[PDB]
Symmetry: C4
Subunit: 257 residues, 4 copies
Amino acid sequence: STLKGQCIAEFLGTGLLIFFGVGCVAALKVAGASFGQWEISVIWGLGVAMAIYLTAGVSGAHLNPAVTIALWLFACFDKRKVIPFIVSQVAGAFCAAALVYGLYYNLFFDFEQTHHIVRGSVESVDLAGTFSTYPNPHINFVQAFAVEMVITAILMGLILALTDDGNGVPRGPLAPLLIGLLIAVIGASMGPLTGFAMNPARDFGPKVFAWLAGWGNVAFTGGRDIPYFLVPLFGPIVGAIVGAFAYRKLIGRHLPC
Amino acid sequence: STLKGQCIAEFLGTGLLIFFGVGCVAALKVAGASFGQWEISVIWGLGVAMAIYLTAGVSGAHLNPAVTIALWLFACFDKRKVIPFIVSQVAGAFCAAALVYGLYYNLFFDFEQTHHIVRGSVESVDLAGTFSTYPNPHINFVQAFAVEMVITAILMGLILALTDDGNGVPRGPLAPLLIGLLIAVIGASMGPLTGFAMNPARDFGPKVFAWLAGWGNVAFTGGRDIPYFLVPLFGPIVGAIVGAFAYRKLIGRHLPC
Amino acid sequence: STLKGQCIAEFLGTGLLIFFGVGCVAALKVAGASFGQWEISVIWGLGVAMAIYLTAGVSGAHLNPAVTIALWLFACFDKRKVIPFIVSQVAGAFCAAALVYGLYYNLFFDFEQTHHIVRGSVESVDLAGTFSTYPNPHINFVQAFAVEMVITAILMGLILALTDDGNGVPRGPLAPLLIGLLIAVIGASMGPLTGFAMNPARDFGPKVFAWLAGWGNVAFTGGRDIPYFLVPLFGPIVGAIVGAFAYRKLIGRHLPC
Amino acid sequence: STLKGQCIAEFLGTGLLIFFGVGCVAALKVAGASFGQWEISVIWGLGVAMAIYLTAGVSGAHLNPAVTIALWLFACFDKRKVIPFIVSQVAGAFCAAALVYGLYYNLFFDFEQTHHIVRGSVESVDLAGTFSTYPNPHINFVQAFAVEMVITAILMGLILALTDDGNGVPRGPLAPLLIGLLIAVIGASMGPLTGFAMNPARDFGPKVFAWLAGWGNVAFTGGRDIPYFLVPLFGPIVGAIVGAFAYRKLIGRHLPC
């Protein structure tokens, strides 16, 4: 497939997983749906598994800038398609957040009117957590960064263990379901800490939309002195690089390139 | 298989998925069972997956008028079997709703007696939601129509990605489980909005039964000025056509016909 | 395999599914565990799937007198092994109920002491529901019988659709998981009605143990004028025969014998 | 693979399953996450399934001293690699418990400050249950020992039924998912009794860490006159040996050695 077709798949695949994940969080927050921590995590995992299955044949189903960067550095992914893949992934997450917000538009404004929440204030960060992840109030910036690095390193280890070539997830039903199951257990055990972002596009995209939607600066900072948005922007990237290096050293599986 | 055998499978397959889905909603409403949003959605997805597996060999396991119409327009489905398939699907959903109502007959009347609900009134629409879907009170007709179009377009995209021929779901365990998993995540994220109908037969059939059972006109209108029953009647049909067109343009996979 | 080895597998397989199913109900009742209707049903389905996988190679993994009888009448199952299979299935369920009761012995007596429940009275039927199924208070004997016939007919239809020969469930992972998934959705939608017994051994076995354990006559009658134990004893048997006949007429798939 | 590579896989595989399992229990206890008994058990099962899949090719994916000992006695596992496997498994569980504690460090101390819990006292055993298992207050030492023996015998029976050689779990997706599903149903039905340890390393490792972390002697004794830590240390070992012997007698499947 050409670069244009590969970029469209990454745009659509990332948007698909954001549509399911953010939509279910919106249902729990403003629609009054009853969702447990395991239920929320299994929706994210199954949504990513479905997005991977529908895009693996075309673009390799990266849907993650951290995965794209690590595959370039520790596999056979071409460097010329790194930047277009990341922009497509970020744009897909931004567009899907707008779509979810449009469908839940009336329920969002009803929630603020009931609880007298003024959008853009510190108390509005809880409602801003529908689109992006925010840390537990008891953890700090360094603790939040460590969580993102660890969970993304585990995720990148499974991806490297599943790839046949060095380009991305192989075709078939086995690989997407394994990745989706890993995301579900990660979000159940480490989710209450940092929102198990594991994806720079999954967080930065919806964060930009929330800033445009009226939340303003608290969408990026999250109400903390140190802007929290750096944790999901670089934590997964460092974690994926660390996890990919560990796999290449403890196993060192051969690759075509 | 002949047309008569294919129509029987569509009648039975659609009835099977309504039996599981409506029965579980009845358990949550009048039987006091504890069910979450994810639990309700996963029951609908697994019920459809089982119905597809038991009917794929005979009739292709459409079980959806929107899927049948879209396959006729954008695949190799014959036009002569479009009308008999739709009537069989609608009749199967109507008959299964009567069966569920018969088994829960005593629990239904006990619920109305306890809460002094008069069947056929505006307050009885909540009990009428056991059989068919009704919108969130905060959303409007246009918003409800947009939800149905989006979710059915995603569902039709997966079906077109799984079909080997242009007639319906292929035989095997992989395709029904993928469709069932997609229905579960759709109902978890967009379910609290419009009941994730995605199926004109799943809604119109039980709606006709509820009108006969004593709910009257509120079974179709739902208590709104604009009759809500048009949203699940045509929303999925438009969504499936839109989703099928997008797949044929962004991918354009070859078909035997 | 010889008859002796086949009977041991049916004894162990039926005991395995009772151990998981009754144990989880005991956890919900006397151990204070939080379990939903979908959670209870999925435990029964997965337990049966595991029991089928461990016994399919030896005895065909019947684990159900209704399935054994229907396979004799509408498939190639030998009539000489019908009686020993049923006795092995009933004995396995009885022995597994005693094992679960032994492990939960202290928690059972603590529950009665706290709530002043005298074993053998009408109020003790709720605690007797740990081992066997009892009807919803609002349904009658005829309504309860109809529920058991319908759900067992659906279960027998899937089994006949999966068998390669006419002896039982084939080897492999596909068939047990399909049966387990069907049991889970059946118990979620029709479970709150009659306990989704679907198995004469699953009910009669533990019912005999509960009578020996001190519950007495209310273990069989359930507090009703008509003894409720006839519903799970013959309802599944009639339902399996009806469901097997429907499959042989609407499909008529060829069999070796 | 050499012994050094096999020991690294057992260290990492055991740490991976402890990271998911203990982390989710920490989320339920100190992070306020909503988790049911089935949800907790399915996280343990899926975490073990993922750990088995990532280590089966190298070391056979034992991740259990009871499984390692039983495979040595009733299969073709070499005796020279029994001790290094057990030490690697115990060290992996100890290290993973420290990692989970580090990530939840602030939430742990906040919980004690709110409830005035002094670490090392009898009331602190409830918080010490995050890392290791402790019995139900109504059961005794003998009852707790019987639970561990029974559940580990069932687990060892499935493992022996899945092994092609006599070294460990075979490669592929089927075997790890079957083991993970069995662990989930075991933890749902027998979990509220003894914490469904089934693994000497899963319990002893985190128990040693909890003693170092400040809980002291109550980490091992659990507040009982007879130290409870002997139940998960030897109960699974006896259960695995008993279960392996039963499989070799009731089936007697041939092995290469």
